[PDB]
Amino acid sequence: LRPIATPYPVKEWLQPKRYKAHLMGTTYVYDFPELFRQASSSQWKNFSADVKLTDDFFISNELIEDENGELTEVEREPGANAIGMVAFKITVKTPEYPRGRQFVVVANDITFKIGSFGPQEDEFFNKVTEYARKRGIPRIYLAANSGARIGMAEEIVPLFQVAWNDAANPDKGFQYLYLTSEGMETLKKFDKENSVLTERTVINGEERFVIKTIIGSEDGLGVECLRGSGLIAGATSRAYHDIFTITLVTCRSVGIGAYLVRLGQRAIQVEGQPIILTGASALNKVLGREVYTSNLQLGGTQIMYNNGVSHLTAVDDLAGVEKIVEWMSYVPAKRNMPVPILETKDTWDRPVDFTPTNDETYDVRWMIEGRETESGFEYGLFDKGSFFETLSGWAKGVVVGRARLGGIPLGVIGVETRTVENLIPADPANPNSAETLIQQAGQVWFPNSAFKTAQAINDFNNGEQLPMMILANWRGFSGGQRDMFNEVLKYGSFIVDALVDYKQPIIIYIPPTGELRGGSWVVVDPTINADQMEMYADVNARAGVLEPEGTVEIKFRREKLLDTMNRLDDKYRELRSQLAPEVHQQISKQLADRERELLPIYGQISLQFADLHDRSSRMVAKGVISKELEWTEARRFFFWRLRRRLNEEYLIKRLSHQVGEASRLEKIARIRSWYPASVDHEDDRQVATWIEENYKTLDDKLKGLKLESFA
Amino acid sequence: LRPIATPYPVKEWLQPKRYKAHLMGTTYVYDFPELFRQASSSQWKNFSADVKLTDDFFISNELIEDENGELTEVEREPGANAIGMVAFKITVKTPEYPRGRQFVVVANDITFKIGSFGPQEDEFFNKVTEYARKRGIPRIYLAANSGARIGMAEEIVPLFQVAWNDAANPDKGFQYLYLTSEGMETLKKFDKENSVLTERTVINGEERFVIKTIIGSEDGLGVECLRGSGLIAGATSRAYHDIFTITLVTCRSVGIGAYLVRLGQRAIQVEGQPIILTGASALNKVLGREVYTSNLQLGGTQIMYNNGVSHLTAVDDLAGVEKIVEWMSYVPAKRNMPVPILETKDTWDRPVDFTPTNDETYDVRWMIEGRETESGFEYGLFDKGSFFETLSGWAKGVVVGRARLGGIPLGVIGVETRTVENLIPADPANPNSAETLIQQAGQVWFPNSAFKTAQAINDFNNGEQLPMMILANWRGFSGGQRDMFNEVLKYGSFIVDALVDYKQPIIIYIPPTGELRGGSWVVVDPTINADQMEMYADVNARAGVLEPEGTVEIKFRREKLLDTMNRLDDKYRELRSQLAPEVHQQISKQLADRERELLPIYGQISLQFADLHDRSSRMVAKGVISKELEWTEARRFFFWRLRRRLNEEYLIKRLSHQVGEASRLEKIARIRSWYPASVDHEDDRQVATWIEENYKTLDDKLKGLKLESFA
C-alpha cells in the first residue's frame, strides 16, 4: 500500500487496474459513469443555477451477458470483467428530459489484455449495439484499444523441432518444422491434439510429424479476431443510420478501433490520444528508414481534427464527456421521438440585432448566435448561447453546428465569408516534400467544404433526426483545374444525395448580403426534396445564373452598349453625322473619342441593369422561393414556420400508420381539411396553435379512421 | 445547296441543324438512334458472325409530350423539336435479350439555343427520367450543352432611362434606372406591364418610374432555370438507385450538365469534349491573370478519366455508343429482372490455366480473363473475352470491371500487384506549383483505391443489380501520415457501407499468392452482410492479424528465440556451463558468439512458425471461411455456387411477397425443407438442377401458401 496515511481509501490500491489505466494516461473504465454524472450535473448548473439535484437524477447499471448470452443489469465490484469490453445503461434526468432519458456506454478496458479485441469482446460490442438499436437509444463508444488480438500457439513453442539441411551447420538452412512422438504425446495428454495439423513421415529410422498448419488451443490468435472486427464494423455502419452514435477517443484507437471511430461518424478526440491504422515503428520497418518518431504524427488531433475524422477535440476525458452530453442535448431521447424543445431566457419574440453589411467583414457566427459589443450584446438569428459548432478543425469555409430557435433544436450550415487558409503538412516519407499553404476564397464551395456540407446534412439526418437551416451564400463551386482534378463534382453531388435522404423540415435561406448562383443554387433547390425543403430569400439577397459581370459579358455586349449610347445627346448627333467624304474621318475619330470616355459608366449601367434581375422580387414572381424576408424579422418568422412544420409533420406520420397507401400531397390536404374553416392555412402561428390545442381531438379523429378494409 | 451533284440527298441541307451540330464537333441529336442501331448490329456480329438481322430487330420511337404533358411516341421529321431536349424509346433484340429489351435515350439538342437548359427542357428531362423509372428500364443521357439558360428582359433595353448626377457630365455617375410615361405605355401596349416593378416619383416637373426589379416577359432568364436544374439533379440522384443510369459526354457538359454526368455515376467521355463547371475565360476574369488557355485544361479526359468522374473514354460518338451497349449487355432488361445469362464458346467445365507465382510478377487481368502466350491461350477464372474494365484511368491499384462466369454476369474487383504511379498536374493558378509523381505500393489500399473499390461495389449494386466477386489481396490500408491526412479512414469506411447495402450474392476469394491482413480483412468479412456474403481462401492464400514479421516482433521476441536456442547442442551446453568465477567471462563471450551466428536462421524459424498459423486450414478450423479452394478448380466451383445462390435468392424473393414477415434464416430453411430428402443441401449443382427442374412446381407450392390471414 502506497501512499500511506490518506484520509479516505486508496482507490488505485483497492483496484490496481485503476492505477494501470492511469499509468496509460486514461480514465479507468469503471470511473466513466462518474464522469457522465459530473457532466450531467454541470448541464443542470448551466441551465438553472438554482435546481437542487439528488443522486436519483442519474443511474448507471453495468450490462453483462447472462448464461444464455442475453444482456442483464448488474451491480458488482469494478474490475470483475472477464472480457475486455464493458457496458453501462445510463438513465439521466436532463434539462431537456427532466423525467429521464436513456443511453448505452460501450467501452474497451485498456487494462484487459491492452484493450485488444478478441472474439468475446467483439461479440459483446455487437450485442450492446443491437441492444441500443432495438430500443432506439443512443450508443456512446469509449475507444481505448490496441486493435484485434494477436497470438500464437504457445504450446507448440516448446515442442517443435527443425529439419536441418545439415545438423552440424544450422546456418545452412532448414527444410520444415516437425513434432516427435514425445511431442505428439504431450499434446495428446493435455487434450490439445487438434492444436497442429501434421503429416507423418519416416526419416532415417525416426518418425517425424511434419507441421502443416498450427491452429492453437487458445481462441483469439488471428482470423477469428478479424471475423469479429468485420462483424462490429458492419454493426456500427448500421447503428449510424438507426440511432445516435458518438465515440470518445480516450487513450488510442488502433486498427478496428480506428474504423469504429469513423463508422460511428460523430467523434471527439482527446488531445494526445491517436487514431492509428499502423504504428510508427511498424511503418518504419516496412519503409526501411526511421521515417516517423511517434504515433501522434500519424493519428493525433493535428491529423484527425484537421481531417474532419474528429468532429471536436477535448483537453481531457471529462471535457470529452461534457461535449458528448452537450451534443446529446439537441438529440431526441430515442429514435422517432420528437426533437427535444428547450426554451431559455432568449424567447422567440424579438428582432435579430446583428446585421451584415456589404462594405464590412463579418463572422457568420455573429449572424447565427450574436456577438458581444462595447454597447451590449447584439442577438443573432438563434438562441443566445445555443450554437454548438462541430467539424470546426476541417474545411473552415463552411460553419456547421447545432443551435436552438426559440427552443427548437436544429442543424445549422453557414458560409464563412473570410478567406480560409489550411496547411498541408510535409510528408516525412518523401524527402522531396515541403508543407503547402492553401488559400480558399470565401463563399465558394471547394472539394473539402462540399464534403463537409454533405457530411453535416447526413449527420443531422441520421440518428440526430433534426430539422435543418442552410444560410445559403455561395457564388458556386471552384471550377479551376486543381479542384476539378480533386473531384469537386463528386463532393458537390454528395450534397444532392444527402438532401434527397433528409426526413425532417429543411429551410434554405439566402441571407442579407447573401447570394446563390448557377452552380450553387443547383445543389440546394427545394425541388431536390419538395416533401421537406423550402426556400426563402432576404430582400437584400441576390440570385441569378451568373454574377452581373458574367451576364453582361454574354448578354450586354459592345453593340448593345453602343446602341445604349443613344441615351447620350453628344453621341446620338456624332453617330448621325458620320452615317461629306473627307470630313468623315474627323467625325469617325470624334465618335471613338466619346465611346472611349463613356464606356466606363455605360459598363456600370449594364452591370446595374443585370443586377436588377437578381432580386428576391423576381424570385417571388417566378415562384422559386416561398417568401421574400426581412432579416430583423426572420427569427419570429422561422420560429413559427418551423413550429407549424413540426406539427403538420407529426400529423403526416400518424396518417401514414393508418390507411398507409396515400401520397404526401393527399395526406397533408386531408390533415388541412380538418382545420376549422376560419383557420388561414398560410398562418403558421394559428395553424401550430390550433394543432397543439387539439392533439387529443385529432388523435380521436385518427383512431376513428381505423375503419380500414384496405386490400 | 452545297455540295452539288451528290449521289443521294445532302442530309446537312435538308436539315441545316445537322450541319450546325457537325460544325460543333458532335453527332446531330436525331442521328444518335442510328448509332445505337449500328452498335447493336455489331454486338450481333461479335456474338454470332452467322446471324441474319433484319431492321425489325431495332426500333426507335421519339417521345414527346402530348396536350396534357404526358409522354407519347411520334414519328416526325428530325429538327421539329420545339424544346432543346429530345428523347427516344429504344426496343432492341440483343444476344442476351433476343426477344427484345427496352431503354430510353434523353439528349440535349446542341443546335437548340446552344443546348442550354431552360424550364421546359428541365421539365421534359424530369418527365423522361420518371417514365424510365416507372417502367424500371435504363436511362441513357447524351450530354451536349451550355448549362442553365441565361437572359435579360430585352424589352426593357430600348426603354430604360438613367438618372445622372449631372446630365452634362455622365462620367460623374448615376443614381438609379427609370422608365418614362412613354416607356410605361410601350409596356402597357404590348401587355408586358409586369415586365418591371416600378415606383413612381416626381423629379422637376416630370414623372419618373424608378425600376426596382426587372422581371421580363420571356421565361428562362434566370432563377426559374436554376429551380429546374435542382429538379433534374434530384431526379438523377434518385434514378441512380432505381434504374441503370449512364451518360455519354458528346460535345461539352457545363454547370448542371456536369452535375448530371456525376449524379448518373456511370459516364463515358468522348476525347476532347469537356465536363466543366466554370469556363476558362470566366475563371481568368475572376483571377485577374490569363491563367487558363482552354476548357480542356479544366474538364478534359486527362482530368475526368484520371479522376474517376469518367469511367471510360471514347475516340468518337459511335465508340461511346458501342461502350454503352456493351456495358448494358451485363445488365437486366429492367429493374428486378434476373441478371442476363449469356453462354459463349468458353463453357464453365474447364480448369483455370493462368496461375500466379510468388517469384514472378503478374497482371491481375490474366487471372480474370486469361492471357495469350507463345504456346497458346491460358484461360483465366472468367469467360474468354468477357472482361469489361471500367474506371480504368483512376486509382489503378484496384482493377474493376464486369465479367461472365459460364455466362453469369457479375462485377469483379481485383488487386493490382505492380506498383502504380500517377501524376498530379501543376496548378496553373499557382506559380509556386510543379507536377507531383506519386508511387503507391501494390496490395495496399490508399484513399483513391479505397474510394474506387466502394464506388465499384455501389455501381454493381444500384441499377446494375449484379452479384459480385472480390479477388481480395490486400496487406491493409496505408497508415502513413500523408494517407491518414488524406482521410484513408473515410474511404475505407465507404467500403463497409457499400457492402451493408448490397442486395445480390457476394463471393470474397483470397486467391493463390494472395493475402488478407488485420486492416484489410475488417472491411471485407462476410459478417458485414451475412445474407449476401461468403468467403473462400485458396490453399495457397495467407491471412492473419499481422504479417509474419509483425507477429514475431510482438510474440516471438529475443527471450523466446534464445529459449529456442535449446534446439542447439553447442548452445545448450554453453548456457549450462555459464550458469568457476574467472573462466565465466570466456564462457559468456562464447554464448554471445553462438547467439550472434545462430540469430539469422532462428529469425527465419520464428518467421516460418508465425506463417504456419496464417494458412487456409486454420481459417476452415476457426470457421471464418466457407471452404478452402484450389485455384485450378475455382471456375467449376464458383459457377455452380453462384448458379445455386441465384436460384435460392429467387425463391427467397418469392417467399417474401407471400406471408411477408419472416427472417431470411426462416425463409431459406423453409425453401430447403421443400427439397427431396435425398438432395444434399451442400451440393450446389444438385440444388440448382433440382430448382430449375421444378420452378413451375415450386410456383404451385408458393401460390398454395397464399392462404394468408396474417394480421
Ligand SMILES: O=C(c1cccc(-c2ccn[nH]2)c1)N1CCN(CC2=Cc3ccccc3OC2)CC1
Ligand atoms: O458569373 C460569373 C462570372 C464572373 C465574372 C466574369 C464572368 C464571365 C462570363 C463570361 N466571361 N466572363 C462570369 N461566375 C459565376 C460565379 N463563379 C463563382 C466562382 C468564384 C471562384 C472564386 C475562386 C476560385 C474559383 C471560383 O469559381 C467559382 C465565378 C464566375
Ligand SMILES: O=C(c1cccc(-c2ccn[nH]2)c1)N1CCN(CC2=Cc3ccccc3OC2)CC1
Ligand atoms: O504486420 C505488419 C508488419 C510488418 C513488418 C513489421 C511489423 C512490426 C510490428 C511491430 N513492429 N514492427 C509489422 N504490417 C501489417 C500489414 N501492413 C500493410 C501495409 C503496408 C504498407 C506499404 C506501403 C505503405 C503503407 C503500408 O501500410 C500498410 C504493413 C505492416
